[PDB]
Amino acid sequence: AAGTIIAGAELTFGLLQNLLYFFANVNRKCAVGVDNESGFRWQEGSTYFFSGTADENLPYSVSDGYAVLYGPRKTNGPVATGVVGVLAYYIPSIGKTLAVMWSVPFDYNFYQNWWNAKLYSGNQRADYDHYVDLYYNANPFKANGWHERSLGSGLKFCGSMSSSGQATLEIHVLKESETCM
Amino acid sequence: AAGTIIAGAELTFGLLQNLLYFFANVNRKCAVGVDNESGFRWQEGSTYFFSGTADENLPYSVSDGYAVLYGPRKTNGPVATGVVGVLAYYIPSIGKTLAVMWSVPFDYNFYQNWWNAKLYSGNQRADYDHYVDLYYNANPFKANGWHERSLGSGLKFCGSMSSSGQATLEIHVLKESETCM
Amino acid sequence: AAGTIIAGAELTFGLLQNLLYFFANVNRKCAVGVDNESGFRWQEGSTYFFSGTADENLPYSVSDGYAVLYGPRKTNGPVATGVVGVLAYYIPSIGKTLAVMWSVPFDYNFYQNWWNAKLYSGNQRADYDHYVDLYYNANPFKANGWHERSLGSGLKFCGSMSSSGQATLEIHVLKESETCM
Amino acid sequence: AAGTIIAGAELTFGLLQNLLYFFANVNRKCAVGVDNESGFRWQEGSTYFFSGTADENLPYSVSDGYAVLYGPRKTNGPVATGVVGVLAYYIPSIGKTLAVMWSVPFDYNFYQNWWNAKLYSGNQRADYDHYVDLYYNANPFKANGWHERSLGSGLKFCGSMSSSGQATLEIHVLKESETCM
Amino acid sequence: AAGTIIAGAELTFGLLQNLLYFFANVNRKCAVGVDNESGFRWQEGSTYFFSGTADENLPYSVSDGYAVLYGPRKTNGPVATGVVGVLAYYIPSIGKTLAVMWSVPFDYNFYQNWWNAKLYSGNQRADYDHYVDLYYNANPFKANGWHERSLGSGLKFCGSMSSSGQATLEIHVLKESETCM
Amino acid sequence: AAGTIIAGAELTFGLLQNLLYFFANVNRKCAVGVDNESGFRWQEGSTYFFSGTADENLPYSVSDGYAVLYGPRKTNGPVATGVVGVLAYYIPSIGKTLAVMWSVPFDYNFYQNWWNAKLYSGNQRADYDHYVDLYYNANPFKANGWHERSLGSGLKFCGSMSSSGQATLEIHVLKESETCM
Amino acid sequence: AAGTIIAGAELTFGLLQNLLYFFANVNRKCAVGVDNESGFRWQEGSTYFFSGTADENLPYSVSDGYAVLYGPRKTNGPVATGVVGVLAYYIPSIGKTLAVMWSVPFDYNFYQNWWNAKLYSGNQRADYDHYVDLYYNANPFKANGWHERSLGSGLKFCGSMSSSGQATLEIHVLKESETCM
Amino acid sequence: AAGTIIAGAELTFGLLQNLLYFFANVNRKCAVGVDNESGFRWQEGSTYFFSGTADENLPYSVSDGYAVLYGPRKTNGPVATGVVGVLAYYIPSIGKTLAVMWSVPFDYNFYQNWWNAKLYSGNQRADYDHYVDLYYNANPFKANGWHERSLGSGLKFCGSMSSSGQATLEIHVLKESETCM
Amino acid sequence: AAGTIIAGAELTFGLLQNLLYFFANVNRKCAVGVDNESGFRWQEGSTYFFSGTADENLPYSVSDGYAVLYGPRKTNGPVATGVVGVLAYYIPSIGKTLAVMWSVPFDYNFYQNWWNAKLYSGNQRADYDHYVDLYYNANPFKANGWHERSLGSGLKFCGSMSSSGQATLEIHVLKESETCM
């Protein structure tokens, strides 16, 4: 009789409210710090997201001795996806664009935190081709403490990423004749 | 018997209260900053909304070196629509009207955040024709970091919009011989 | 049997308490600012409401360089009607009465926010004929940013109204040789 | 069987507790301000209530340049009646008694806020004949902004009342050669 | 069967707890102020209650230019009776006892607030004969603003009582050649 | 069947918890002030209780110009009895013991607040014979404002007790040539 | 059937939780003050409990003009026993041990608060023989205000104990030529 | 039928949650203070636990005139065991290791608080043989106030332990020619 | 019938929510302090986790007289595993990498807290081979107070670990001619 179906509805929507509340209350976050000590002005700050969003703007420019601070997070409500995105700036003193990438996935059973950076030719704002090149075609870093690499064109970077689901990411971008932190 | 229909009512209005509470508790917001460093007085500040509303007034005028701050939001209660609107000012020193447009939709499965600006001939306050011209007939910007364009008549703008469901929007309006932020 | 009717009463009064609580907890509000910079004394401040009420008094008079601040609201409890009303003052230096009108309706499916002002002959306190003349027989303004008009007799006004369900309204009343805000 | 009557009692007293709580939690209030700038001493301050009560005393006297502040309210608990009352003072310099009256009813479907004042012959403390004379036999003012009238004997008053269910009432009592507020 | 009697007990004690809580949570209070400016010392301060009680003591004496402050209240818990009582002092400079009486009843459907005062021969502390003489055999005042009367023996009083269920009472006792407040 | 007996137990222990909570939450309290201005040292402070208890000690002695403050209360938890007790001191300058007694009963349907004091021969600490002599064989005072009596041996007292269920008690003990408070 | 036994379990453990919570939430406490003004050093401070416990240590020594403060309490959780214990110190200037004893029982239907003190020969730390000698074989004091006795060997004490279930205990230990408090 | 087994599960897990919560919310704690005034440096601070744990480190060393403060506690969650452990230091100026032991058991129906200390030959960090030697083969102290003993090698200690389930333990370690606290 | 299966679901998901909440609310934490007083610069700080995560970065470098502070914790939500990981730095003044390891397991029925450190040849960042070499192939320390060992190459360390489930770990790394803390 229909009393079984009504009790089945109370169980069904009782479980569904808790399942949607669980996916809404799992936090994935990133906090990206990119210190410019490269000796060049950076400008035209741009972004892309494969997943997640940021509430604030970038600085339009980053003069010598100042830092980008920028805080992505997961898409809000019951959607089960993480943060994955790109950041970029153009460096008119050297004719190239710095790009930075990170990932902080939702499902850690198949994925892990990653980051990368490159200095591309000309002016090209962050997009899906920069994501696929920084994440698949280049050699990305995993999130386990400090890594250092040349960008070419007289510049290098040294940086690290936390392995946490709420990840801090830090990069110092600097001249090849200088030492980090 | 009628005891089934009464239990069916308890389930029906129990679900409906939670569904209406969900649509009432989803926030879409915008916060629009338009810095005047154009060297001209702006006046006769006007608006239009295709969806959403603002609680405060605009400034009647914006003298050189001052900013519009203006905060649209969704229509309150269970109505499932976002913020979509236009802002305008008349610039008597150059005989044209600056117009600014944004969108922060409710359903992100089909739509995304956008913005635009133009400098139209004569005096024309914000309306549905300015919305359709800024959103369909012109080339609007998507919400991914800084963009810059000429207005004509000796002016340009540089600005950005957040990809979030609670979006910050920032524009600097300035002379074509000058540099942003 | 009567157990069905008793359970039907529990459902009936359970829904009715929530329906009356909803109509009691929907806020319609107005906040009216009328800055006198007209160069004349205003006195005999009077009002009318087609719907809604105000808790405070008007100032009896408004000397040059001072403002009316006055805050109407909906009728309290489960009554489903908005704010609609008139304000007036007599200006003995010019032999006329300034009148101001606004509307902030309950049902936005059929109505919208409006405002108006006029400078009528002689002394006539606010009433239903001033409401119908300001809302139907004159050309009222809708709530979308700044509008400006002559009153005649050497005076003009410039003002705006918010499109919100809790609406701010602002008017500056000034000499025809002067500029707003 | 008797189980129906017991469930009928749970519904009956469940509704009655909410109905009595509603009539106990509906507020009718008045706040009466009577500024003496008449140039005469007032004394022997007295009152009457047709409905409602005040917790504090009047001042025994009001010298020149001071005000009565006095705050009536409805009778407490589930009783469904408003505030209706009279205030009076004797003015020994002119041989007459000032009387003031107000109403703030419970049922607004049939009644509205009113006020009045008069300057009666000799000494007569506030009573039901002063109420009926100020409310029916004289011409009372309704609660819509400022009204002004002569008392005779060299005095006038100017005053206003709020249309709210919690009403502020203000009167200035002054010489016929002087101007209000 | 006995299940009806058990459900009848749940209803019976459910109603009785709320009825006793209602009679325990209805407040009757008095606050009695008796200013001595009579030019004589008062002493041997004494009291009586027909209903209600006070937590503090009286002053043993009241010298010239000082006041009795004394705060009766209803008997605590579910007992449905008000405040009714007498206060007295002996005045050795004139050979008489000042007595003061008040009432603040529980059931306002049959009773109202009253007060009185007298100056009796010799020394006689407050008792049931002073209550019956001040409330029935003398002419008491009702609680509606200021009243004034001679005590005889060179003294008078002027005083008032609030009509509220929590009543303030004020009396000034003074020489027949002087003016109140 | 046994389901009736189980439901009868839920009612029985549901009522009993509320009945024991009521007797535990009815407060009887006393606060005893005995000002020594007798011109003699008091010492060997002692007590007795027929019902109730005090948490603090007495002072061992009371020199001239100092007061006993001492705060009895009912026995804690569901026990339905009040405060009834004796206080005493020895006065070595006059060879006698001051004793003080009070009562603050639980059941006011049969009993009332009382107090007394005496100055007994020799040294005798407070006990049941001092209680019965101060409460039955002597003439005790009831709790209605100030009373005054000689102790003999050059001393008197003047004092009062509140009629409340939480009673303040005050006594000044002084030379027969002096005046109270 | 077994549904009766399950409902019997809900009643059984529902009552048992409240009974254990009652025995856990009944407080028995003591607070022992022993002022040394004996003119001798005290040392080797030791204790015993027949019931109850203390959280802090004693001072190892008490020089002239200083006091032991020490706060026993009942054993925690549902155990229904009070505080009963002994304190001791050795006095090397006179070759004897001061011992102090108190009781604050759980069941006042059969027992009352007691205290005692003695000055025993040689060095002997507090134990069950000191408890039985101070409580049964010596003459203990009951808790009703100040008592005074010689210790022998040039010393005396004067002290008191509160009759409360949370008892303060105070003793001054002093030379036979001196006066207490 | 299976409805009995389901109701039996509700009772079973309802009782089990409360039983595990009880064993998780019973606190056993120790707080160990070991004052070094021995005139020698202590170093290589080491520990062992038969039950319980400490969150902080020991000091690596204790110079003359400083104290170890160290706070063991029971193992967290529903495990029903107390604190039992050893502490040790090496004293290079005398070629020996000080060891200290305590117990604060869970089940007081069979066990009590104990402590001990010794000065062992050579360097040997705290372990199960030090526990068994300090608790069974040596003569330990019970928790009842101050005890004092020689360590040999020119040193002694004096110390005490509280009998409480949250026990303070204090030891002063000092030269044989000196006096405690 | 299906009513049994629905009641079985209420029990099943009622238990499962509490079981997942228990595994989510059991805390395993570590807090690692590594003081550099080795007289050499440390750089290229790197990590590995066999289980658990850290939210913050390491310092890129540790100059002489400064400390690593670094706080691992368990993986968040219902996953039942502890903290187990490695830390490393390169020391360019001596051509070797310092590595540090710890464990703070979830299941204490089979495992205990451990730590270790080594100074490996060349530059090699922390990984699974450093974990297995520090935990199985080398001789690790258990968490019971201070241990000290040579690193070789002129360096040693002295350090300790807490036995708690929230463990503090401290190491001082120093020249072989110097003394700890």
Side-chain angles (χ1 to χ4, degrees), chain E:
Chain E
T4 304
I5 304 301
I6 289 172
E10 290 187 302
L11 268 291
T12 299
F13 300 113
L15 264 64
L16 182 63
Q17 178 178 358
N18 282 282
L19 181 65
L20 296 176
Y21 177 83
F22 170 72
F23 297 139
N25 197 47
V26 166
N27 291 310
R28 299 296 184 260
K29 279 165 55 187
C30 194
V32 184
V34 190
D35 186 348
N36 180 16
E37 63 189 336
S38 69
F40 301 143
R41 175 182 170 84
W42 305 355
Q43 65 182 46
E44 303 158 49
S46 58
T47 71
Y48 175 73
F49 288 103
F50 179 90
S51 290
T53 57
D55 300 299
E56 69 275 16
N57 307 331
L58 293 174
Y60 174 86
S61 68
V62 193
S63 50
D64 184 27
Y66 292 90
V68 182
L69 281 298
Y70 182 58
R73 56 166 182 76
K74 73 178 301 285
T75 187
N76 194 251
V79 24
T81 73
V83 170
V84 183
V86 185
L87 168 63
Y89 277 90
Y90 180 70
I91 306 184
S93 307
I94 204 63
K96 288 194 176 177
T97 179
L98 173 72
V100 174
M101 182 285 300
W102 60 92
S103 174
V104 183
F106 189 86
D107 193 357
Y108 283 115
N109 198 240
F110 325 110
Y111 302 110
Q112 70 196 264
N113 298 8
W114 296 93
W115 65 282
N116 205 353
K118 281 192 65 174
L119 186 67
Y120 290 92
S121 54
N123 196 350
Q124 294 185 340
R125 59 177 56 244
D127 63 17
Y128 184 76
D129 291 347
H130 287 205
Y131 166 58
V132 169
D133 285 342
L134 291 172
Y135 191 89
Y136 294 102
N137 299 327
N139 301 113
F141 310 108
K142 47 166 61 179
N144 75 304
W146 289 83
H147 284 271
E148 179 173 350
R149 190 193 285 161
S150 181
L151 292 176
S153 301
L155 301 182
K156 63 173 184 173
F157 68 94
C158 65
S160 65
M161 186 177 190
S162 178
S163 58
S164 184
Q166 305 185 44
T168 295
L169 196 174
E170 179 168 7
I171 300 177
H172 307 165
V173 182
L174 75 171
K175 188 176 174 65
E176 284 184 308
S177 65
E178 298 192 346
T179 305
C180 307
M181 191 170 279

Side-chain angles (χ1 to χ4, degrees), chain A residues 154 156 174-179:
Chain A
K156 63 173 184 173
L174 75 171
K175 188 176 174 65
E176 284 184 308
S177 65
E178 298 192 346
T179 305

Side-chain angles (χ1 to χ4, degrees), chain H residues 42-53:
Chain H
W42 305 355
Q43 65 182 47
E44 303 158 49
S46 58
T47 71
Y48 176 73
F49 288 103
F50 179 90
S51 290
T53 57

